[PDB]
Symmetry: C3
């Protein structure tokens, strides 16, 4: 019954027996068993190969998550938002917020679902908070000096500090009960209402050819125009976006036809329910048999092909039907399931690396999960600042993290409480590194709250350079205390 | 004979017996016994109420100190200074310096008078030094870029570093003997002489209506003009300044009549000696009886009313007599006694909070005493910079702390040695937080000494932002080591 | 057989017996025995005098090293470089690099030659790296904003980071074997080749009167023109440069006659071989007798005077002979031997101070050796920036440290391996301060690598102020952990 963190203190011939009958480290969900693979699929000689290969697979999964969220998830959420006839700011605080922060939220939802990994979620949430408010905001001001917006800044910084200190309290007590989770969700509702009300009160005051081009991930002219590095990224993510364009339908509101592609969409109307049944709960309910008479994948593919022929006959190949926002909805679902599968694999990899090297969940979440999840927003915000709109970038910077922390903790803990039939989610402490992380986030927030108003909201290079120096120093201190030079 | 820091390890029914016969924490001065009140006047259920109420009382006492020093003490010192026909710079380095730094000096004088509290004085002096040279000077440069004055800066920084390192030596040896205290006062005399000589060598090279308006603390037009927050502060300090205008006489040199208010002043000529006899040594001498025939408060009120009628008859209600600078002197005395009473109460509150929560004198004096004492200069210096005179603000910033440390340690230790009949004041060490505070002050001074000349005395936003970041980090480290995450 | 760090725990009457028969601290090179002197030449009463005197002697030796390198070593290297008809950039990366970094390299060569002192070399190399990339580069940007050169910066920063991480690996393994040393030298060769190839591909894309004036170290007009401080430095280094001008010949390429001074040079053609034989290995091979018939100093002085008369007769007193670049070579040798003697004395002083005060080699090399060695580079680079060429200063800043670390570790360890007949140089760890130093250098490099490109290579005051603050904080942390307040 030994904890399988004790697998590196065994004779190398008996690590198979341990890994294959110790139940302490069996992935809660997923497809690949990374720890049987790392220990006795590869020969003990070449352990560094297994770990280098796992790190490259982690990086490619982060690319998968970013590409899926930016190009397929968020436009479908926007299609639904426009279909419901909402304004710009309510949309940008609810639907576009969900779309922009998808990777963090799904990562927290997966980590909170298992007692052994719940320390990854806390580390990743606080670490992403520390990273976005120092490196991204600072870099935005270094790239371009601008005059920041007062009211969004003060609103966002105040709400974020309240949410953060509430989470420190929950960490200290050592638990999250469903009253606390419902409190997180209630605070989010109050934030959306205050944004709406403040912005209102201040405003008043041949088929086959089009199928082949539809499935074609790449355009000749742009690819011939970009540099070498952009070509390299495009060829890196070509398989990802081929599977995406093949299996998720995207409704786009700016277009005249609204990306209506009659053969492609009427074929995904068969392809996508199969992806749902195979991906939901990693397939257990997919292969489950009802009654022993009608198999499950068979019935879903049969009904899918029936209704795909039904819609193919009923529509012509020029003008969309009157109800393809349901294509928007169906695309939302299967984009969400793709993100869920990628996040489950990422969390399993990080857990296995923690078992092998006897690392802590806090440092793994603090560094690798946080950076991998924040690469997307960093890229988006820096591009927006360089184009000539740094007010928008600095606003979105502080606007995203509130949604992330609040919805992530709320939903993740609530769903764990519901499926587990428990009354609380225990937050066991991983040493005293969690309090170093907490104090780093706290002081960062305090520095921004004092500095930006005192500059009269005129931000420049000095502010960003100070924040960048602070982040480098914090990371060095974390690494030095994790590996045992400075012990607390 | 147990130390009453051991009162929180007793059965809650026996905390009365301890607090009322343990002599370890029977404070030797003041009016209110905060520790009997916190333990068994309030029911043990609602201890947080007692402490919230004590924190609000601390804040109001800091407001009392600031209002009394700025409006009543310093103008009387200036009235005496002008009456003696002094120049601007000698006055600004002696009399106006005393007036501007009153709260720090009286706080140190009170803390040094008791072996159990002498750690508050060291913490407060070093902490105010760290705060003024990072947050106030930095904020001055952030608000407005300017070209600093070379000679005042170099003079002040050199003198301050000598005084600070001398105090580190005294701390290391663990004592202050009266030779050291007289040395502090001698260094102050040398500093004043060098300022005089350098500035010279570089320059050469119905009655009732006026009584009611005299007692009226508030003016209609200004109050109607200010915002909500200023109205709130005015109504907060109306009782304070009513008692002040009632009991301390102010002679003002710019006015044509020199705030001569015949009925008000000839009535304070009775009111003020009573305040002196009731406030001196918290009243022990006041109620003491001489000979058993003539009571003390009676004789002072009798002589006061006699001489008040005598001066009322002898003067007319338009032109001051030829000797009301004696009103300036009498106002100086009773302003000083008000400040002494407020500082005694503040020190007793901090000591009680240290006993209850088992905190150290160093951290309490490092933060609460230092911030409460420095709010005044912060406000004055930031207003001066925003008005368009940041050279003056940056000069006064480094000019005040020399007076504070030098006169505070000198006088406080000298008076304790005199009343105690001892030969030294023992400086017992409160752990290794005092050396963290010492090194923070040292590095702050070294950074300013290198940076300002290297910029060619052209100061801007980057300097101040670096200093602000350093102060936030230092406070976080102090809090983290006090509460036990990082132990030394 | 006790370690003589245990000499301060003995009765003061028996410290002579220990110091004169303990072989643990009998230094194996140099002229003065600093530890016999500090313990029982001076009376035990006045130990502070011995140490103050030793600190002044250390400072004067650092001045000796700087004056010898800048005025006598480097011009001779340049004379050889021009004589071989090289271009500007190859010369500036090989010969002028050697000349500019002489003190660091000779210091490392001396420290690595003894197991007891090899910790001084690591500390000094890493500490000089930390100092040059924070204080010198930062000060250059504070003095003058400029647009930095991209390609030199990126080349230099990349090569330096590779060299530094390679040395951390060698430190972790605990050894340097001659394969590693040859690897250091091979990396240096690759760096020189890449600089050459990149710059090429981007470019294509009465006798007695002249003798007395020759020996005259001082000029009247300049000395009458400078200030008091410059006069003080000139009189401080007059004896140094008198011995230098007397015993080392300098060939200078800009001059019309090329500093050809017929009597002075034909006399140094006797004087200099004597200095070589007396300075090489501190004189052991000098006084060694061959055969017992011809003494060594006698034969060298005899042959020297013979060939000096021979060259005096053969040449006239106006035009140089056709081969005085051999004077350049002979001057190179004896300048190198002067630098070697001064560096040996400096290392012996630091070792004795470590034994007396029980300090570590890491902190001694981190601060005193690093600062003393880098004063020259800082003076040269700050003067160059103030004159109006800050691109050149910022280039030389990062270009010097690569040569320093790479050639210093390579040659020092290689020569120790060769003379010792061993297979490796053991790098024993002095606690956990070496890892604090390593992490400081690492983060500094990372900050510069991120910040400078992000600013678009437009450098100003904010960058330098951040770097200066970081260096002050790092030094305070080092001092606080060495003296035991913060223990790791």
């Amino acid at each position: 019954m030994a904890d399988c963190r004790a697998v590196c203190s065994l004779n190398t011939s008996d690590r198979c027996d341990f890994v294959k009958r110790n139940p302490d480290c069996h992935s809660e969900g997923g497809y690949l068993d990374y720890l049987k693979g790392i220990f006795c699929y590869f020969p003990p000689n070449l352990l560094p190969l297994a770990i280098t290969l796992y790190v490259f697979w982690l990086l490619y999964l982060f690319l998968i998550l970013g590409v899926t969220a930016a190009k397929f998830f968020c436009p479908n959420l926007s299609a639904i938002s426009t279909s419901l006839k909402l304004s710009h700011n309510v949309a940008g605080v609810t639907f576009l917020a969900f779309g922009n922060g998808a990777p963090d939220i799904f990562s927290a939802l997966v980590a909170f679902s298992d007692p052994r990994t719940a320390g990854l979620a806390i580390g990743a949430l606080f670490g992403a908070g520390v990273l976005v408010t120092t490196v991204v905001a600072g870099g935005i001001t270094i790239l371009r000096p601008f005059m920041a917006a007062s009211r969004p800044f003060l609103r966002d910084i105040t709400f974020y500090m309240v949410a953060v200190f509430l989470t420190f309290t929950a960490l200290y007590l050592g638990r999250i009960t469903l009253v606390w989770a419902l409190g997180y969700l209630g605070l989010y509702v109050f934030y959306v209402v205050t944004v709406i009300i403040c912005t209102w009160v201040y405003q008043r005051q041949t088929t086959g050819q089009i199928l082949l081009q539809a499935l074609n991930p790449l355009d000749y002219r742009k690819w011939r125009t970009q540099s070498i590095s952009c070509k390299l990224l495009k060829v890196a993510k070509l398989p990802v976006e081929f599977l995406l364009l093949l299996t998720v339908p995207v409704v786009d509101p700016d277009k005249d036809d609204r990306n209506w592609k009659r053969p492609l969409n009427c074929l995904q109307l068969v392809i996508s329910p199969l992806v749902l049944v195979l991906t939901l709960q990693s397939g257990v309910y997919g292969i489950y048999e009802i009654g022993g008479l009608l198999p499950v994948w068979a019935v879903v593919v049969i009904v899918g092909t029936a209704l795909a022929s039904v819609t193919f006959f009923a529509t012509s190949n020029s003008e969309p039907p009157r109800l393809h926002w349901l294509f928007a909805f169906l695309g939302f679902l299967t984009s969400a399931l793709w993100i869920n599968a990628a996040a489950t694999e990422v969390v399993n990899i990080l857990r296995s690396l923690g078992v092998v090297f006897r690392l802590s969940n806090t440092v793994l979440g603090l560094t690798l999960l946080a950076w991998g999840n924040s690469i997307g927003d960093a890229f988006s915000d820096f591009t927006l600042a360089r184009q000539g709109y740094p007010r928008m970038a600095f606003s979105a910077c502080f606007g995203g993290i509130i949604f992330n922390i609040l919805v992530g903790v709320g939903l993740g803990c609530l769903l764990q409480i519901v499926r587990s039939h428990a009354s609380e989610v225990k937050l066991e402490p991983d040493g005293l590194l969690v309090w170093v992380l907490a104090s780093a986030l706290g002081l960062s927030l305090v520095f921004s709250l004092v500095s930006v108003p005192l500059q009269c909201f005129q931000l420049s290079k000095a502010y960003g350079l100070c924040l960048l120096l602070f982040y480098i120093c914090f990371i060095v201190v974390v690494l030095l205390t994790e590996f045992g030079v400075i012990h607390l």
